[PDB]
Amino acid sequence: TRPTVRPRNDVAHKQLSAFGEYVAEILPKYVQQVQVSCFSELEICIHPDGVIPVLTFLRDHSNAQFKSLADLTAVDIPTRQNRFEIVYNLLSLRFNSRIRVKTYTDELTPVESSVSVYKAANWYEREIWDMFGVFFANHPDLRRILTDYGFEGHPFRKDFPLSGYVELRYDDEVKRVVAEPVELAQEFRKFDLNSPWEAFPAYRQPPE
Amino acid sequence: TSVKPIFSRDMNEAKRRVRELYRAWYREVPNTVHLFQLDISVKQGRDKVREMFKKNAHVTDPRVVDLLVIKGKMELEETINVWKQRTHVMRFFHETEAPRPKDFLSKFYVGHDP
Amino acid sequence: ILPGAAYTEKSATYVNTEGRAQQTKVAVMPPGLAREDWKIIRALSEIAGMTLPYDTLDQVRNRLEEVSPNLVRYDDVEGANYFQQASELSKLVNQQLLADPLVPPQLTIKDFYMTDSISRASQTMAKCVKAVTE
Amino acid sequence: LHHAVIPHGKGGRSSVSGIVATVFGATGFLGRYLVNHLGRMGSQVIVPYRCEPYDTMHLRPMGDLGQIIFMDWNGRDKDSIRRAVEHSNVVINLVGREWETKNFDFEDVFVKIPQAIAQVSKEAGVEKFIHISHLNADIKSSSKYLRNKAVGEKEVRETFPEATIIKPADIFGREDRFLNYFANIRSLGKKTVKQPVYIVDVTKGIINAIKDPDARGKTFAFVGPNRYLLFDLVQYVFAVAHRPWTTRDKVERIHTTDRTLPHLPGLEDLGVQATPLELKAIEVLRRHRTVQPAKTV
Amino acid sequence: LGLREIRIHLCQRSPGSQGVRDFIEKRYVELKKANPDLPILIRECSDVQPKLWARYAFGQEKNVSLNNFSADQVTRALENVLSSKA
Amino acid sequence: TQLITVDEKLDITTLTGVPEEHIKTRKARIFVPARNNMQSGVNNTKKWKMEFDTRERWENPLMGWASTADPLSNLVLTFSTKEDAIAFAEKNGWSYDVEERKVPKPKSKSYGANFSWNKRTRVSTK
Amino acid sequence: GVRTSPTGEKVTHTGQVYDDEDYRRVRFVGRQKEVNENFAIDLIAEQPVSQVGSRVISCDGGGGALGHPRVYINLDKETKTGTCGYCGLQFRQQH
Ligand SMILES: NC(=O)C1=CN([C@@H]2O[C@H](COP(=O)(O)OP(=O)(O)OC[C@H]3O[C@@H](n4cnc5c(N)ncnc54)[C@H](OP(=O)(O)O)[C@@H]3O)[C@@H](O)[C@H]2O)C=CC1
Ligand SMILES: [Zn+2]
Structure with missing residues (x-):
């Protein structure tokens, strides 16, 4: 399997597994799962009451020093009752490593804002509000950041359509750009591309 | 059924926040009609505020009306500070849209929508 | 119409x-x-x-x-019960059988392809009927 | 009814209204808002234009792709009128002038060109023709405008007997020459009574006359809700505008009172709420700014 | 003016429909002999409560609950229907 | 305490920003999608889908393209179970109807049945 | 091989022409309906049937990797020629 297969990094896999054990036993109040991927990335899956303790630990601990918030992300998964998956990508410059911190909420439970831990998060979780509707409690200036000013709904939710609900045009009668319900001259043609045959037997979910 | 609140522990605090948000909009409407130089009257914009508040008058969950007050404060903040333009404020008044058929028979005449 | x-x-x-x-x-x-x-x-x-x-x-x-x-x-x-009551109601008026034999209206594949207004308007069913007759 | 002209959609920009309209005189004040309100339904609008194509640019954002067809035409050319009307199912006539020029006088603009358009639309099988007269059009009028426009109304009726003739009184809007005339005149007060009508009311009425089959052969009188004296109307215009090119035919028409014809239908027989001047006068006259409302009769 | 049709709904297995089932097992045959041109639509279903629909002239439909009745109460309600024509 | 007691049905229709036309007049269909009989693979029949009623698709006057006015005409969701799908439809105020999952019944396959002594299940060829 | 409707409008190789009462002819008024006059069904009919002596021939449209995928055409039917599914060139077994 030499030329075309990605070579596995066993050293970093073992190191990130040991550090995941370390984080799981220092913070067992909040840590739910710890998993290391096959391409050597460490995910810490936490309870959302420990956003500030887990991130402050990873920022300030002498064996962590994850001083850099790379990215902050929600993922909408509608089949879960806590459908929003808040992902924290942290970067350690001292130990040259990355860690993923993941937690959950639904549409109504707020997540505690992490601008006291990372000032990078100020626009990121504001974008998560704008795109998903995840309210972040005790945020300095939480409002929209990317959508238009009168915009209704949260576009990156998966029950939100691709073209939205309203579209704009200029109207010469009222001398004003107006919002009218969306009508496409050509509908977005949905392609059912999924193959009816299983591709990855290692990822097979067990039957009921 | 034990959920973490947003701002209001129950519906009375929630209605307090709805009431203060309505007070803030009612004070703001003359300023909005003036500085955006809208072609509406102050009574007409206040009727639109009352329409938007009576639209959500069925909600019995404190967290949902906490989020409704939060989004109403965000709309208010975009309207007091001139972040919206005149077009965003007039998008509440669906003026270029044709009046939709209401009863069964006119909806039958124009098309297939129920 | x-x-x-x-x-x-x-x-x-x-x-x-x-x-x-x-x-x-x-x-x-x-x-x-x-x-x-x-x-x-x-x-x-x-x-x-x-x-x-x-x-x-x-x-x-x-x-x-x-x-x-x-x-x-x-x-x-x-499921529908009460066959006995329908049978007792069927024995009231004695109707007689005609001497004509039981002939279903669709004897061969020719009479299959056109029965209703959508099949009779179908050119594919017309090709089917023309193909099974020749 | 042909299959491509069956209405579809929810009545929006990409929908199909089934209205294929040729609007003569579409580059003007009324044609602007008529092509606006047609193209937002999804109508195939045909715009014969006399002018420079730069002056028809504002009509292109008014409908979806391929829904406004521009073409050259001449008022004395029946070939261009036929080339414009032979595919339409409604022809709206909006050709007019406030002033007569070297080539086109009031008779050519109001009698020759309307009867030519109506006759060519008649022989091209166009079902509907909608002609715009004036409310004060009279054979015995003192202005040459209203005499030629009454004669043209007569000829359009007797060459297209199912046409919908419409009598606007004095249309006010942003691009009017009624309130913008008074805001710039800075003529005198007489015994004149007027009831001006808003341009969106006139446009909604023309479209409701397109859609209603009961408007064929009728004559409508589009008037506002409130009759005003001329003098306090002009003082209300100067009061809204925060203020302290003419000819004698325009003076003859300003000092000609709006006749009341209750035997003719109006905007309410087309289902249009007449908008009063007090709501839209600020919208017209905000541009002229560097108020007790007007007294009705 | 007069009665047009009678609809009887019932479950096949519920104990609330036991009286309706015991009505249809015994008295329906002489009911239909007594009413030769009256449609009496017995419509069994899976979990419904028993019900006596009676349609009169001009689309007027009265609605009678037959839940937990005996066969005698179903006979009395149905003969009230046949005697009313209201 | 810092946990309140909400005894109400979870309804977020005021928060999703969807217009009332596309909330109260739409019918969600909750179903396991049927196997494409062009193929023997069954991997597309594992998850619950939510689609909506198909509204009008008309012809573009210019190009002949398929114009639409339905925003939810391409919206297909994916659920692990039926109950997650029903909870999502009730949470968003969508009227729904649910088809139960259709599994193929177990078959009794015998290659020896093709060559029987006294049964009709002999194959005439192979 | 373009032909013309009685309205004067040209007909494409699909067979598309607008009707006499269809309003959408107004888009060509003062302009032109652009058709291509090289009809492919007429041009491939002008190519002669290739006489070959094998029972199975192959075709890739000429040019190697510049044509189409290489397909194998049976020629057992003596009544009908064997036609390529991609390029439309047709073949006949000479015996
Ligand atoms: N308040 C009002 O304006 C009222 C108007 N009316 C009538 O309504 C109609 C439309 O009014 P309105 O829009 O305001 O007037 P406009 O002068 O603004 O528009 C007239 C239109 O006709 C065209 N036109 C004018 N003269 C000629 C000509 N000789 N040959 C070809 N085209 C010509 C103009 O195009 P181009 O730019 O190419 O010249 C323009 O599109 C007129 O008939 C008018 O009499 C009735 C009551 C009130
Ligand atoms: Zn080939």
Whole structure:
């Protein structure tokens, strides 16, 4: 399997597994799962009451020093009752490593804002509000950041359509750009591309 | 059924926040009609505020009306500070849209929508 | 003439030969000014001043449940008892058999392809009939 | 009814209204808002234009792709009128001038060109023709405008007997020459009574006359809700505008009172709420700014 | 003016429909002999409560609950229907 | 405490920003999608889908393209179970109807049945 | 091989022409309906049937990797030629 297969990094896999054990036993109040991927990335899956303790630990601990918030992300998964998956990508410059911190909420439970831990998060979780509707409690200036000013709904939710609900045009009668319900001259043609045959037997979910 | 609140522990605090948000909009409407130089009257914009508040008058969950007050404060903040333009404020008044058929028979005449 | 929807053009309850109620779904919309059928009858009742107490399809199906509640229980065969009582009612008026033999109307594959208005309008069924006759 | 002209959609920009309109005189004040309100339904609008194509640019954002067809035309050319009307199912006539020029006088603008358009639309099988007269059009009028426009009304009726003739009184809007005339005149007060009508009311009425089959052969009188005296109307215009090119025919028409014809239908027989001047006068006259409302009769 | 059709709904297995089932097992045959041109639509279903629909002239439909009745109460309600024509 | 007691049905229709036309007049269909009979693979029949009623698709006057006015005409969701799908439809105020999952019944396969002594299940060829 | 409707409008190789009463002819008024006059069904009919002596021939449209995928055409039917599914060139077994 030499030329075309990605070579596995066993050293970093073992190191990130040991550090995941370390984080799981220092913070067992909040840590739910710890998993290391096959391409050597460490995910810490936490309870959302420990956003500030887990991130402050990873920022300030002498064996962590994850001083850099790379990215902050929600993922909408509608089949879960806590459908929003808040992902924290942290970067350690001292130990040259990355860690993923993941937690959950639904549409109504707020997540505690992490601008006291990372000032990078100020626009990121504001974008998560704008795109998903995840309210972040005790945020300095939480409002929209990317959508238009009168915009209704949260576009990156998966029950939100691709073209939205309203579209704009200029109207010469009222001398004003107006919002009218969306009508496409050509509908977005949905392609059912999924193959009816299983591709990855290692990822097979067990039957009921 | 034990959920973490947003701002209001129950519906009375929630209605307090709805009431203060309505007070803030009612004070703001003359300023909005003036500085955006809208072609509406102050009574007409206040009727639109009352329409938007009576639209959500069925909600019995404190967290949902906490989020409704939060989004109403965000709309208010975009309207007091001139972040919206005149077009965003007039998008509440669906003026270029044709009046939709209401009863069964006119909806039958124009098309297939129920 | 009142242009109606076809079975691919309306969500619509059909019951098969065994009592299983089933609903179609709207694949496409009817062509031109053609409308759904109960919409036409309900609009006719509103014009005539004898308005039918339903507006949406769900209310038509509430009426349909009021007339027999197994028309809204979809993909369900409801069993029917009381063969004995129908047999006792069938012995009342003694009807006589005609001497004509039992001949079904569809004897060969020729008579299969065109039975209703959609099959008779089909050029593919016309090719089928022409191909099975030659 | 042909299959491509059956209406579809929810009545929006990409929908199909089934209205294929040729609007003569579409580059003007009324044609602007008529092509606006047609193209937002999804109508195939045909714009014969006399002018520079730069002056028809504002009509292109008014409908979906391929829904406004521009073409050259001449008022004395029946070939261009035929080339414009032979595919339409409604022809709206909006050709007019406040002033007569070297080539086109009031008779050519109001009599020759309207009767030519109506006759060519008649022989091209166009079902509907909608002609715009003036409310004060009279054979015995003192202005040459209203005499030629009454004669043209007569000829359009007797060459297209199913046409919908419409009598606007004095249309006010942003691009009018009624309130913008008074805001710039900075003529005198007389015994004149007027009831001006808003341009969106006139446009909604023309479209409701397109759609209603009961408007064929009728004559409508589009008037506002409130009759005003001329003098306090002009003082209300100067009061809204925060203020302390003419000819004698325009003076003859300003000092000609709006006749009341209750035997003719109006905007309410087309289902249009007449908008009063007090709501839209600020919208017209906000541009002229560097108020007790007007007294009705 | 007069009665047009009678609809009887019932479950096949519920104890609330026991009186309706015991009505249809015994008295329906002489009911239909007594009413030769009256449609009496017995419509069994899976979980319904028993019900006596009676349609009169001009689309007027009265609705009678037959839940937990005996066969005698079903006979009395149905003969009230046949005697009313209201 | 810092946990309140909400005894109400979870309804977020005011928060999703969807217009009332596309909330109260739409019918969700909750179903396991049927196997494409062009193929023997069954991997597309594992998850619950939510689609909506198909509204009008008309012809573009210019190009002949398929114009639409339905925003939810391409919206297909994916659920692990039926109950997650029903909870999502009730949470968003969508009227729904649910088809139960259709599994193929177990078959009794015998290659020896093709060559029987006294049964009709002999194959005439192979 | 373009032909013309009685309205004067050209007909494409699909067979598309607008009707006499269809309003959408107004888009060509003062302009032109652009058709291509090289009809492919007429041009491939002008190519002669290739006489070959094998029972199975192959075709890739000429040019190697510049043509189409290489397909193998049976020629057992003596009544009908064997036609390529991609390029439309047709073949006949000479015996
Ligand atoms: N307040 C009002 O304006 C009222 C108007 N009316 C009538 O309504 C109609 C439309 O009014 P309105 O829009 O305001 O007037 P405009 O002068 O603004 O528009 C007239 C239109 O006709 C065209 N036109 C004018 N003269 C000629 C000509 N000789 N040959 C070809 N085209 C010509 C103009 O195009 P181009 O730019 O190419 O010249 C323009 O598109 C007129 O008939 C008018 O009499 C009635 C009552 C009140
Ligand atoms: Zn080839």
